[PDB]
């Protein structure tokens with residue numbers, strides 16, 4: 001797969017874009033999790049699948065029985081990994097571009113975490129899309145948080161809902177989704 005277009009997909013607490021605390025997520029948003037599954041899994045054509053790409057620590061964060069994420073090609077990046085195809089669903093590599101050179105019959109490519117990977121790849125020109133779930137809370141400063149996105153969103157353009165709807169096909173997009181004290185919305189951004 002040569003020069004694929006790649007999407008970052010992430011859920012972040014506004015305005016500081018917090019995404020984790022001590023290696024774990026600071027919320028469990030059931031509908032958001034289902035959205036993550038649907039969008040990363042769904043393809044627009046028959047006989048293909050998507051690839052999900054993540055750093056080694058994000059991989060290890062998944063309970064070993066629940067990885068690889070089903071119905072998607074899983075790609076894990078480590079600075080200690082030489083290129084290796086583990087099985088049909090798992091690839092080891094040290095860069096996204098080189099990992100994807102090993103691949104065919106893949107439609108969309110998503111970056112699914114974590115912070116370090118996100119903060120590097122936002123400045124990689126293969127990334128064309130940001131699927132950001134904007135989370136809001138009455139007192140965001142009260143949420144334990146030590147991990148943040150460093151995204152230069154001034155070089156990006158938040159698209160209208162119709163563009164996101166087009167991207168996700170028939171996936172249902174509910175506005176102002178509320179779980180506990182969190183409210184959230186799915187967004188789509190493209191390079192300015």
Ligand SMILES: NC(=O)C1=CN([C@@H]2O[C@H](COP(=O)(O)OP(=O)(O)OC[C@H]3O[C@@H](n4cnc5c(N)ncnc54)[C@H](OP(=O)(O)O)[C@@H]3O)[C@@H](O)[C@H]2O)C=CC1
Nearest residue numbers: 011020023024025055056057058078079113114115116117
């Ligand atoms: N809110 C959300 O939607 C999400 C949040 N998260 C959050 O992110 C946090 C974890 O992120 P973080 O700790 O940064 O972990 P990451 O998953 O980003 O992994 C970092 C590791 O990835 C590998 N890596 C980084 N850069 C490269 C590179 N250029 N080439 C090859 N390998 C590379 C390295 O592995 P190695 O050391 O083996 O070389 C590095 O140690 C958690 O708190 C989690 O909750 C994660 C996913 C989603």
Ligand SMILES: CC[C@@H](C#Cc1c(C)nc(N)nc1N)c1cc(OC)c(OC)c(OC)c1
Nearest residue numbers: 009010011033036058061062063112113133
């Ligand atoms: C390994 C990817 C990470 C994520 C994410 C993620 C989510 C939820 N939402 C959005 N908008 N972007 C993301 N990138 C993730 C960790 C987990 O902990 C074991 C999961 O099981 C509970 C999980 O369910 C599949 C997913």
